[PDB]
Amino acid sequence: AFGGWLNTQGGDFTNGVTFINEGGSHEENPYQGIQIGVDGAPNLVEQGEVVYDDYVFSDRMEIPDDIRKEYKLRGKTFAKAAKSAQRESEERPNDPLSTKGLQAAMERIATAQEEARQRKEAHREG
Amino acid sequence: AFGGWLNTQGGDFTNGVTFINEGGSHEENPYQGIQIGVDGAPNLVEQGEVVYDDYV
Amino acid sequence: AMQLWVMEYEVTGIGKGCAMCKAINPQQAEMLLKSNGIYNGSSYLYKVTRIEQVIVPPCNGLMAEQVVTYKDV
Amino acid sequence: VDVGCAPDGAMQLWVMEYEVTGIGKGCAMCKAINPQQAEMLLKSNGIYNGSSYLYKVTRIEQVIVPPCNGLMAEQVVTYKDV
Amino acid sequence: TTIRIQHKVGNKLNKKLAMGIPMVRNLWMHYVDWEVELQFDEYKNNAMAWGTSNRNLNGEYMNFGKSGNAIKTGAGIFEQTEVANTMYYNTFSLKLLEDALYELSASKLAMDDRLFVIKTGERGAIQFHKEVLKTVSGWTTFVLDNNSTRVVEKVQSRLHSNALSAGFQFVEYKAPNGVRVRLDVDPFYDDPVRNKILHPMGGVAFSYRYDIWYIGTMDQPNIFKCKIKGDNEYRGYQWGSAVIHRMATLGVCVLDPTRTMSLIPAILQG
Amino acid sequence: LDTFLNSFPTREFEDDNEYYWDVIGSSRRNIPLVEARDENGVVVAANAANVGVGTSPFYLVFPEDWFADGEVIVGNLNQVYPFRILGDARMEGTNAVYKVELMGGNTQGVPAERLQQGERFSIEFAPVEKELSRKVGDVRFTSPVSMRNEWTTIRIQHKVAGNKLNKKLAMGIPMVRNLESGKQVKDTANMWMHYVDWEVELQFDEYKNNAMAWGTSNRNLNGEYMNFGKSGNAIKTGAGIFEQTEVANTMYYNTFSLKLLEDALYELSASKLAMDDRLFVIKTGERGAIQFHKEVLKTVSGWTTFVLDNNSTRVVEKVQSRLHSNALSAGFQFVEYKAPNGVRVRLDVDPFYDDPVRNKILHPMGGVAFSYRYDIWYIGTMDQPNIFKCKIKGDNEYRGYQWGIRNPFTGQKGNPYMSFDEDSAVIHRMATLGVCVLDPTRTMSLIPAILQG
Amino acid sequence: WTTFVLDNNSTRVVEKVQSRLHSNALSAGFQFVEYKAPNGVRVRLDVDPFY
Amino acid sequence: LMGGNTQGVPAERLQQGERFSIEFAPVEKELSRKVGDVRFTSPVSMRNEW
Amino acid sequence: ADFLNFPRQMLPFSKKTKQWRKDCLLWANQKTFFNYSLVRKSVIHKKINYDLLNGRLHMSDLELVLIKAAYIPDRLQHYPIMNSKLNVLRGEESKRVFDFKVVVTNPNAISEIEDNKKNELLQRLQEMITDTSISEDEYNIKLEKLNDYYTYEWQDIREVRANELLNHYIKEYDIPLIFNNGFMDAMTCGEEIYQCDIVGGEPVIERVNPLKIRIFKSGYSNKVEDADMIILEDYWSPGRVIDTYYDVLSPKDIKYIETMPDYIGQGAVDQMDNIDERYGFVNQNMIGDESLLPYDLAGNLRVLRLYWKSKRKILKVKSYDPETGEEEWNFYPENYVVNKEAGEEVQSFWVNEAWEGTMIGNEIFVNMRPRLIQYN
Amino acid sequence: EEWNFYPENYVVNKEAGEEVQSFWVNEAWEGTMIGNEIFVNMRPRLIQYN
Amino acid sequence: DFLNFPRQMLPFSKKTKQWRKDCLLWANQKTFFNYSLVRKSVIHKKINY
Amino acid sequence: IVGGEPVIERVNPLKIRIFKSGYSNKVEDADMIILEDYWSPGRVIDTYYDVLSPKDIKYIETMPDYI
Amino acid sequence: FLNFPRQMLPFSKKTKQWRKDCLLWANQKTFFNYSLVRKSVIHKKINY
Amino acid sequence: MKTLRTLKISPNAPDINSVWLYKGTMKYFNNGEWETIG
Amino acid sequence: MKTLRTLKISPNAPDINSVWLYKGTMKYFNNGEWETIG
Amino acid sequence: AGKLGKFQMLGFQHWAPQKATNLMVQLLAFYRGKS
Ligand SMILES: [Mg+2]
């Protein structure tokens, strides 16, 4: 399926990043999403958003330029930013340094998404 | 990282002298320094100062 | 496979030329020019004018000279 | 091939191009002991050895004799070059 | 077309041997499994592309085999594509190429699909540069500057601060009504064993050949290689001595040869 | 000169004997024609009629048995006159004659002008029928010839008295050292023997590096060595870097011309190097770059179809100064020529070419004559080191002292084993060394003729 | 119209293209499609395959 | 004369002012004996007054 | 040939693209005429050793020959008196004891880090059993199943697993036979080599034929592990290349497996279409009067695996614990940005990385990537 | 995520997130020829040693 | 010599009964090379037996 | 110490130069011991990864291909 | 250099070039030892 | 027809698109030959 | 070898690097003097 | 505008030291056959 997985030498080796494709958007899919799990119980995602460690990187927002220069992002979207920092550990899922290189880089795009979320929430009420 | 260490033969050998660099002063830092330890609990050091045996 | 032959030829309408072959008799040196020369597709353009063998015991001497002037063209 | 000439004993064959300044270009073939001697034969035994300063030699390249038959060297000075 | 090879012998040379002697100033074991599978690989490459038909207009073959049956050989790529839009020039001129490409495109092509890729040799790419350069030399209405063409640009060098470069090559010409004529080099036109007539401007005189395959769009391939389903290549070993037989059938097909235009120098004809 | 020699790698060898490396050509070849005979064996001349007029057999005499039983070979006009061979070669002594009829449907015959001596013939393919087909064709191979080089053994010697063991230098003038650079550097070591073994490893670095670079092989045309040592054996010398590089691409000149540097770097790498592999980087002197700058300046002045603006070449740049409100500067140089079809030429001025201590002939345009020499050391990539420094595995230089009662170098007072009875200590050091250039055709040079070859 | 120098920078008659043959590869070609006469007149074209 | 040279050096290369420098000091393989030697140099000084 | 090198390995990981890995394998196919090492004999010297044990006398080995027809009036009969000596030693190696157990070397050395990782395990086992047990019916059964693991230790759990893997696969694979054939390769070559990798998701061990492994770039090491570049060349079944590589083969590549025509594209043809004449030259240190084609007359496939140590840029990062004033060190890849204003200092290192690749036949380029089993 | 291996007859259940990829794998087949006119059991071998 | 077997990259529908019979008329009267890569010849083994 | 941890090797007796021992049967009495070997390029980077400069990695990288 | 560079030094004068001049000496003048309790290398190599 | 912009002072021949000046005579390139002015 | 891009019609000598045009002549700078053509 | 002979191709009928390189050397002064 190639999305965040390396299916070589007979086995299914992953780094944790969950590329969720083939669904469609939340309005295009009749189930309003993918429903990856029952935990909120309807955890719904779309064709673009990507999950690492139960944190969903949304594909609908964009990258503000003040949030781009600090934390040093590469993509134009928060989902596309996590789709670039995993490119080392996509081909090396079992490495000790690429695991630490992934968990550190996914924590930056996590805290970059929350600062864009908190700034949008503060600007909407104002 | 070369500050008071000898990273040689794959190991990290130090003499205890800790070069607390690359952060900045107490005023230009957002967290007022580097905050190496919690003991007064906000124990702050800057880019220039150097500690030995918890004496700065 | 015996001797060496230095030739002065004149390509008609195009210009002059100098050459050097290795042949047993100087008619065969014209064969190795008319068939292996640069004007193979126009092999009738060669009009050779002087063939002389490389006679060694001088070993310091010109064997072919051919200048092209500004008034010949 | 120990005939008795200056560079180590063997005969050396050279191809020379030039451009006679104000007159045109040409080809030249010579046996010589040095490539300096090859351009001193054009200034001595050439066509324009009287006006010896007009010879501007631009290439002096050696021919090595092959084992068997074949066209060794060729040089064309065409009219549209001149 | 059907081709066969053999070799009477195992890793060692045999009676057909050649030596290469270079002229400098001071003057293993052959893998017979690999030369037979290479010099039959090139027997099929010459049969597919450089093939000749030996049939009448009456259908009869003319050349008979060792068993009395007729040798069936079909035409190659360079014999099927040399039946239409093929010209033999003595001197290259853009007056002939920009007009032959236009009348082929004034009567066959719409104005958007007029992209002609000249697949030519290496020395024929220099011949295409110099004759576009003489065409630009006669465009005296527009003066050409280094600001647009940039034949003299600035590169960084240690020797001088303001250090220039020089060099350019025309590789395209755009005739009126949108005839865009590109250029690339196939390496097989400079083939020193196959091409024996030498051109006066350096090369092997087959490099100076311009071939326009792929005229327009078709909705299918025009030129392709034919093959038999299953496995059409054979092999065989006859032991005494050991004779490494191989046999194969092949074919090429040009559906519309009026959709292939070629320029050959006239010294390679007749 | 030593920085230039360390830009080449080093190979390790087992012996000091001769070493050889074997070069190879192609397996594909065309064969020149000798003679063509008609149906009954009568030779065809140029003023004759056509030969294979009604698909009638005829002959082709070739100087070597190269072609096979049922192949199709072609003349100078490929695919127009296809010649199917009939039967194996009949050997007329060394030659080979084939029975041959036309193949590609030709019903008028081959012209008599297409069957002359000198015409080349190459194999295309070997066709058969569909039914009851018999064996045809053959397979050809190719062979290696060898190249050859050998080694050169140098030596040094210096003698001091035994009085100089710990002789302190009371420096009236400060004692200087000779550097490898040529500079006299100052030193402050008060002992004399520090300036004795430093000038003998200065000098041994100068002896090796002139033997590796500047070599003269003294093997004769008859394979003999005429220069004999003091003991009676032959002093054998192997070629250096600058003798192995000139054996293939010999080129000499008086007047530099760019048209012959560009049409000879394209003749050798015509269809053998790819379009990205034709970067030819010229090593030259400082004055060789000025001569190269003028000839590109003379070349782009012939490009009259283009005009060369100030706005792009920037030969008159604006500068700021107190003398004027809009003050100008001036100066330009041509350092790169891009030939047609991917060939580029770049200048690398190296300080080795301008050394006036070894280079003594001056050029008429100033500077040493060795500055105007253009060398393209590396043409393309080779998959193995083309130029490398041959060094023997294990032959460390024998530091060897014979001495008497004192040794001023090692500093030994009192000797148990005496060579002789005098206050002396001599150094003897010697090195067996050579170089090798595998492909001197991958290296194009351009030498001024005033160096006299 | 020799009163005006018509340089190649404005018309882009010869314009640079990217090919594997050369790092600085050039093209050629142009076509006059329109001629604005004096006093308000413009002359355009409409090339029809009917003609 | 090394380099294998048989026909000697011309007499126009052997005149006054022709400069000569050390290249190297070659010996044979079997049973060599001592060659070559080592050179030294020394500086100068200057002066001034009031 | 006539143009290649080994590609530059001091690159960032983004520049090691699909062609760069393909250039490494196309270089590996060049070095197949050659097998030279500092502590190995030649392949001809090894292959003459085996055929003395398989009953072949090569008459060009014991003397100069001044034949090729197999008759003792012109040849020599061979009498296998060496086999009965080596068959004693491989009959005894089977009968020695095979109790190869993962042991804790210091079984009374329990640390706080070994105490922390044990508590993370039993908390994770406690988190599972609340989900599996449905409202106290078998929660008291799952509790007593893990109560006896409170007396275990962390080195005991890791020794239980490491023995539970080895006890199963010695009894499944018959690993005692593998080392018994590999002993026979060691008394004949002097070289005993084994490969362990993952195929089909399960681990496997196989003895490498010493006539088919090229151990490059070692440092007079007795060990084979210390090599930088290993090429394993063999002729596989077409079923084995789908037994191994089914999950990475494209539908283009299974048409080359099915219909397999002769090719010359394997580095023989250059970019300017030149054919390389030094491919059709096999050596005589590698073959003799007793190898590069993509397939065999038995209908097999040539599979060429290259293992090379590429170089990787990593970063050594010095940070501080927030709670205690203790410097700490970590290793991060080159795409890690250091969080300054935390005292975070960085130094960049270049570091080995085990890369692999596989060329099946002439076209099929498979598993060109960093080797996912890094023996870290 | 969980992985399953289905034959080509199985249609992909999209809109629930199923991504598919198509592999070619081995299959043990069997057949018997008795005499020359009897052809029997030309089928996949029914003991699949999976 | 090569083991020319029929085409196996088919869908399961196109493995019809003539295809299975064509795969099984590949085993009748075939002659091959006498000894395989790891096994001696049959005329060798019958001499031993 | 190699790789942070202790390691033990046996030394090839032909590839060790023991200087300045005073007629002593041991080797630890020596004042100058030189071990010259031909290490692999992978063992240079195992042992000296933290002390090689990026210039020195290039010299390991630009070494000529003697395979 | 003449001998091994002067070891009777203060620790601050043992700079980057003093250590390199020591190590360059071992590259050059350390091949020939009159070992007092060892055999020659050519003698030991014959024994192996 | 053909517009020339350059006048060269050279004893040798210039390029064909530039006017030859040499010691008192003027030549210009027309129809493959050097046509003199006088 | 010495290009003269411009031509200046003036009764005085205009410049070294331009071609002087008078009534019935056309002079140019050569050998340090003005040489007329024809 | 002229060539010069840099190689010559003859048949075999027209006719151990240490090794510098162990592989063969393809010269530039040779034509290479074209596939
Ligand atoms: Mg056509």
Residue numbers in the entry:
A (entry chain GT): 425 to 463, 466 to 552
B (entry chain GU): 425 to 463, 466 to 482
C (entry chain Bh): 30 to 102
D (entry chain Bg): 21 to 102
E (entry chain BD): 203 to 211, 213 to 230, 243 to 455, 475 to 504
F (entry chain BC): 52 to 504
G (entry chain BE): 354 to 404
H (entry chain BB): 153 to 202
What's written in the study?
One vertex of the capsid contains the dodecameric oligomer of portal protein gp20. The portal is surrounded by the five-fold symmetric capsid vertex, contacting 10 major capsid protein subunits. The 12-fold symmetrical portal oligomer sits within the 5-fold symmetrical capsid vertex. The localized asymmetric reconstruction of the portal–capsid vertex (obtained without imposing symmetry), determined at 3.60 Å resolution, showed that a loop at the peripheral area of the wing domain, residues 268–319, is flexible and can adopt two preferred conformations (types A and B) in interacting with the C5-symmetric capsid vertex. In the type A conformation, residues 277–290 of this ‘capsid-adaptable loop’ are oriented radially away from the portal’s tunnel axis, whereas in the type B conformation residues 292–306 of the loop are arranged tangentially to the portal’s circumference. In 2 of the 12 subunits of the portal protein, these loops were not resolved in either conformation (denoted ‘x’), resulting in the A-B-x-A-B-A-B-A-x-B-A-B order of the conformational states, counting clockwise if viewed from outside of the capsid. The result is a pseudo-five-fold symmetrical arrangement of capsid-adaptable loops around the 12-subunit oligomer, assisting the formation of optimal interactions with the five-fold symmetric capsid vertex. The portal oligomer positioned in the vertex occludes the binding site of the capsid auxiliary protein gp36, which is substituted by two copies of the portal vertex specific auxiliary protein, gp57. The gp57 dimer has approximate two-fold symmetry, reinforced by disulfide bonds between residues 47–47 and 25–88 of the two subunits. Notably, hexameric capsomers bordering the unique vertex contain trimer capsid fibres of gp21, in contrast to the hexamers bordering other pentameric vertices, which contain dimeric capsid fibres of gp29.
